[PDB]
Design a protein around this ligand. Structure first.
Ligand SMILES: [Mg+2]
Ligand SMILES: [Mg+2]
Ligand SMILES: [Mg+2]
Ligand SMILES: [Mg+2]
Ligand SMILES: [Mg+2]
Ligand SMILES: [Mg+2]
Ligand SMILES: [Mg+2]
Ligand SMILES: [Mg+2]
Ligand SMILES: [Mg+2]
Ligand SMILES: [Mg+2]
Ligand SMILES: [Mg+2]
Ligand SMILES: [Mg+2]
Ligand SMILES: [Mg+2]
Ligand SMILES: [Mg+2]
Ligand SMILES: [Mg+2]
Ligand SMILES: [Mg+2]
Ligand SMILES: [Mg+2]
Ligand SMILES: [Zn+2]
Lengths: 129, 85, 144, 79, 148, 80
RNA sequence: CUUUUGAUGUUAGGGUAUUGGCCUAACAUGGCUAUGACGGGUAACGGGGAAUUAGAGUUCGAUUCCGGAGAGGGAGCCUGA
RNA sequence: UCUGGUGCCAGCAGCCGCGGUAAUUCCAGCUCCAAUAGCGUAUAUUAAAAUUGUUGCAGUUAAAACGCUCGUAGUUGAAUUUCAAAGAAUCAUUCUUUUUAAAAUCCGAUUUUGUUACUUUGAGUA
RNA sequence: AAAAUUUUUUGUUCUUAUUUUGGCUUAGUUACGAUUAAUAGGAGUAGCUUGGGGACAUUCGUAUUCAGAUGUCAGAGGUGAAAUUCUUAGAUUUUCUGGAGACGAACAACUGCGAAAGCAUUUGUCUAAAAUACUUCCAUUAAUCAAGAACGAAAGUUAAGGGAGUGAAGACGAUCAGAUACCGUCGUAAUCUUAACCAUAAACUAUGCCGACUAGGUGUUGGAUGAAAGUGCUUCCUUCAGUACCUUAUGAGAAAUCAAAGUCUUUGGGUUCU
């Protein structure tokens, strides 16, 4: 039983990236996966991707650029306040100069710097270096 | 309420005779005082009248059987043998 | 998973699991068990006073070879009897048949130390003058 | 590469494992000799099918595709 | 599987085209009338679908009409009080219980009967949470045989 | 089961800081129920505070909402 | 577990500065509990706070201020806002 | 790896250890080291301890997967319903405007459209 | 159907009405009104589909032993070597006849089935279980599970049978310094069936259960698809389910080693027990 489709997608992407595979297939898709992929796209971590339309939950194929070190989820989506970002980023990110922590916010999905710029909290989804 | 934990039917014997003899009496008398299906009429109303005689309270037929039960296995085996032939 | 529940509503299970498992820790069980008030001559204190009853000598453990000098003491506080070590080269003949002494721990609070089998106490004062100032012998003399 | 798989390879896999799941069965027109009637039939049929005019057997059930009667001619239905 | 160790994946799969095929000729009224007539004879929905697939040419009922078989069987007040699969489970249980009455030394049969009764209780709870079964429906194991 | 008196159950979640997680908790409250209402075990009620009317009761019912349940009342979890 | 000796409610009164099983009569069979009742232990007065710790935490708080209780141990009472 | 004495004795040593003639460890003399108006000892407690582990431990052989299955409470559970699109403000980025389905509501027009969790901002506080 | 501003009659008041409103019975009009069908789950249908899965009843086989015959004559057993033991009242040995109770060789495998414990002569009946095929039905019905429940080798206990072989105890004969042992000759309980208890094993893969991803080859058990040699059957090619082995790992480990014991300071898919 699945219990999460985001974790499986991110794990598959990470496993393929470790081997330099140049393309990978994600079986179950959803809107949250699309939004996460778009945010990775906006930061220049992956190329373009397709959505294949069967009459079930669709499938995705992505293009990889040999550029991701890690991508994963935080399973319990802890609720984070605006003044608690500093501890989480200090614990999770590898540096103060790169990397991203992804929150889900009453104003959409965004990373921590944009969340500070918008003066908002949320819950944690995942991260990618 | 439940009036007795263990001895059940043998509580009429009190504390006499020892526990294991009371256990064997209980096993025998559970069979002796039960009801059995009458194959002739369909009702379960056959009860023992004497040590070998069984009788149906509804249709009133008399069947010769065992001492504490209506059938013993040794007779069933021989009947099955003959019927198979 | 890894053998723990990681859900957003699974705090009771974790709390109870940690509550039950602390009792397997020797230090925790030692410092939270009700009988320490009973099986301890000092009953929680650091020092105590007593009257000397006997002088004895104790063997050292096997690889070593010596006769260590000790006294047997009856505590004023509760009447119990203990055994205490007398440190110093010739400090045993500063002590008479029944004097009053302070004794303290011996450094490993519940445990025996080094070479002496089964002695967990040590004399620090005799006749209310310091044993060290009396062994230095250039400071004070016993109140005869 | 992954988006445009070789059609020979795709048609050569399990039906649940290809990019778009598609069945392997089909419907067909069957003609038995000397009866002069056309009947619809399903490959992998589970029942025994009798002709409309005469009670002649047209197929037999198996563990896979049905066994078509000897001498009959079948033709796929176009779609 | 739910109880054993099997991991089979055999099943049917539906085509991409959701519309009815071009070569199909019947009228939805005819198909519904066939459904009703063929259920008058004492068949279950799955049997009805199989017969329609084989002895008639209808690949899928939902493509031609707009409804599924159970909905149109209910629209006429023809559906049974007890759903199909639950009834099949109950029949298997009553058969096993009879055999076990004849043989007190089957230990495998006792095991399998326990498993089927667990299935029965779970499915019954699901059907009672919906309004498909009356709230005081219980499945006594001693009176189930007369249930038809 | 009393005369013009009922018991209601409130469910809520409690936060534990050391583990960053929650727990399920509950409390019971006795209330007064006027005969202008038709209640049974499983419904939802809204109550308001008044002066003490007995050793235990301090609330009484103001509005009733019919609600169907399938298990037993003490085993349901509704949060509000 | 509680309920003969008030345990959980309804009715009528008594009493109090006022509400209330706080008490008295009649009636009904209720109330709490594995989300830990009812019991046992504490070398337990509760907070504001203290010590040590990168972040989490662990351990203390008789003792400047606030609240509670007591005047060898129990019970009763007068004066008076 | 300085002198004198003792010789498994006397004694030292939290731990490993030293002590039978050469004892860098006992008892003294000299000289050096550390902190310094302060410096040792005993008991309790915190870090060290990712040796109690939510962050963050281990379970083939080091301690540790119930003989096996069913099962209530608990914990956890596939995808889907308004997605967009076009101008302005900045050295492609960050911001900010414009409307596109509907019904009720001022002579071709303003304003309303389920409940919580959760998150933002306030009030009140020795 | 229940009340009316607006005039009406009266000094306590009496005389009447358009007058502002929820439903019912029927005809009528709307864009009138129900998300997929999960390489989740449960039911169904089909095949002269598979299996040492279970229960009852039946059928066969040599061997062993007892009893009855049968012919002959001095030893037979057993051991490292010998005793104890059987025998001219005929032992051991060869042929035939009847009875009894356990067991099911060879075929038989790094093969099959079951939740585990376990399951192997023939035939019949009853009873379940997978896997494969499907353009059948339902539509979230699910995963793991304190308390609780069902099964659970051997030994052991209770009662009634059965009682050949093996044989805890016991008795001898040997070896030895001693030998309450290892070896040998006897031999009680038990081992088998029926009806009840007991609930433990190195009950072991010393590796909980569900889901995803990651690598090449050689086999094998059971289905389905497509193609060639046959004298509506065999070989070959695909694909699903089960089960082994080999090589290799910019994968892991303290190592032995491991296709999971990998995808872990780049530490969080769900959950129970220790
Ligand atoms: Mg399960
Ligand atoms: Mg009274
Ligand atoms: Mg205080
Ligand atoms: Mg004070
Ligand atoms: Mg005093
Ligand atoms: Mg500590
Ligand atoms: Mg710690
Ligand atoms: Mg630390
Ligand atoms: Mg450890
Ligand atoms: Mg196991
Ligand atoms: Mg499906
Ligand atoms: Mg015999
Ligand atoms: Mg015998
Ligand atoms: Mg023998
Ligand atoms: Mg065990
Ligand atoms: Mg084990
Ligand atoms: Mg780590
Ligand atoms: Zn009769």
């Amino acid at each position: 039983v699945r219990m999460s489709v985001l974790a499986d997608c991110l794990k598959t992407i990470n496993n393929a990236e470790k081997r330099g595979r140049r393309q990978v297939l994600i079986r179950p898709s959803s809107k949250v996966v699309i939004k996460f992929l778009q945010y990775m796209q906006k930061k220049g971590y992956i190329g373009s991707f397709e959505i294949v339309d069967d009459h079930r939950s669709g499938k995705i194929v992505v293009n990889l650029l040999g550029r991701i070190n890690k991508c994963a989820v935080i399973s319990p989506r802890y609720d984070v306040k605006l003044d608690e970002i500093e501890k989480i980023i200090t614990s999770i990110l590898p540096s103060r100069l790169f990397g991203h922590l992804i929150l889900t916010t009453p104003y959409g999905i965004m990373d921590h710097e944009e969340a500070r710029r918008k003066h908002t909290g949320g819950k944690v989804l995942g991260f990618f270096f | 309420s439940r009036r007795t934990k263990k001895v059940g039917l043998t509580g009429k014997y009190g504390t006499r005779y020892g526990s294991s003899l009371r256990k064997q009496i209980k096993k025998i008398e559970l069979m002796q005082h039960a009801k059995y299906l009458c194959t002739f009429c369909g009702k379960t109303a056959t009860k023992r009248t004497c040590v070998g005689i069984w009788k149906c309270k509804k249709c009133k037929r008399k069947v010769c059987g065992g001492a504490w039960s209506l059938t013993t296995p040794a007779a069933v085996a021989a009947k099955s043998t003959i019927i198979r032939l | 998973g890894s053998g723990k529940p990681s859900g957003l509503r699974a705090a009771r299970k974790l709390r109870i699991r940690r509550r039950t498992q602390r009792w397997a820790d020797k230090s925790y069980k030692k410092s939270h068990l009700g009988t320490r008030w009973k099986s301890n001559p000092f009953r929680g204190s650091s020092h105590a006073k007593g009257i000397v009853v006997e002088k004895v000598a104790i063997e050292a453990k096997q690889p070593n070879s010596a006769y260590r000098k000790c006294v047997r003491v009856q505590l004023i506080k509760n009447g119990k009897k203990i055994t205490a070590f007398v440190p110093g080269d010739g400090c045993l003949n500063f002590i008479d048949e029944n004097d009053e002494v302070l004794v303290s721990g011996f450094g490993r609070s519940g445990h025996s130390v080094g070479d002496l089998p089964g002695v967990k106490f040590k004399v620090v004062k005799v006749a209310r003058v310091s044993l060290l100032a009396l062994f230095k012998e250039k400071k004070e003399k016993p109140r005869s | 590469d992954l988006l445009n798989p070789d059609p020979v390879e795709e048609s050569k896999k399990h039906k649940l494992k290809r990019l778009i799941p598609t069945p392997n069965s089909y419907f067909m027109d069957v003609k038995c000799p000397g009866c002069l009637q056309i009947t619809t039939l399903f490959s992998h049929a589970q029942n025994v099918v009798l002709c409309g005019s005469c009670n002649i057997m047209l197929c037999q059930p198996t563990g896979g595709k049905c066994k078509l009667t000897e001498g009959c001619s079948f033709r796929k239905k176009i779609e | 599987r739910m109880y054993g160790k099997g991991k089979g994946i055999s099943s049917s799969t539906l085509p991409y085209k959701r519309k009815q095929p071009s070569w199909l000729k019947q009228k939805p009224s005819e198909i519904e009338d066939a459904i009703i007539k063929l259920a008058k004879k004492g068949q279950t929905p799955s049997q009805i679908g199989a017969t329609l697939r084989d002895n008639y040419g209808i690949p899928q009922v939902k493509s031609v009409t707009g409804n599924k078989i159970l909905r149109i069987l209910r629209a006429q007040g023809i559906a049974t009080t007890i759903p199909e699969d639950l009834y099949f489970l109950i029949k298997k249980a009553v058969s096993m219980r009879k055999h076990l009455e004849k043989n007190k030394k089957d230990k495998d049969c006792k095991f399998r009967l326990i498993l089927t009764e667990s299935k029965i209780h779970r499915i019954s709870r699901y059907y009672k949470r919906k309004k498909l079964l009356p709230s005081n429906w219980k499945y006594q194991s001693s009176t189930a045989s007369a249930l038809i | 089961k009393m005369k013009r008196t009922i018991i209601i159950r409130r469910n809520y979640l409690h936060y534990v800081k050391k583990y960053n997680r929650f727990e399920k908790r509950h409390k019971n409250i006795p209330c007064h129920c006027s005969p202008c209402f038709d209640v049974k075990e499983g419904d939802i009620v809204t109550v308001g505070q008044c002066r003490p009317l007995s050793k235990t009761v301090r609330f009484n019912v103001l509005h009733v909402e019919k609600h169907q349940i399938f298990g037993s009342a003490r085993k349901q979890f509704v949060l509000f």
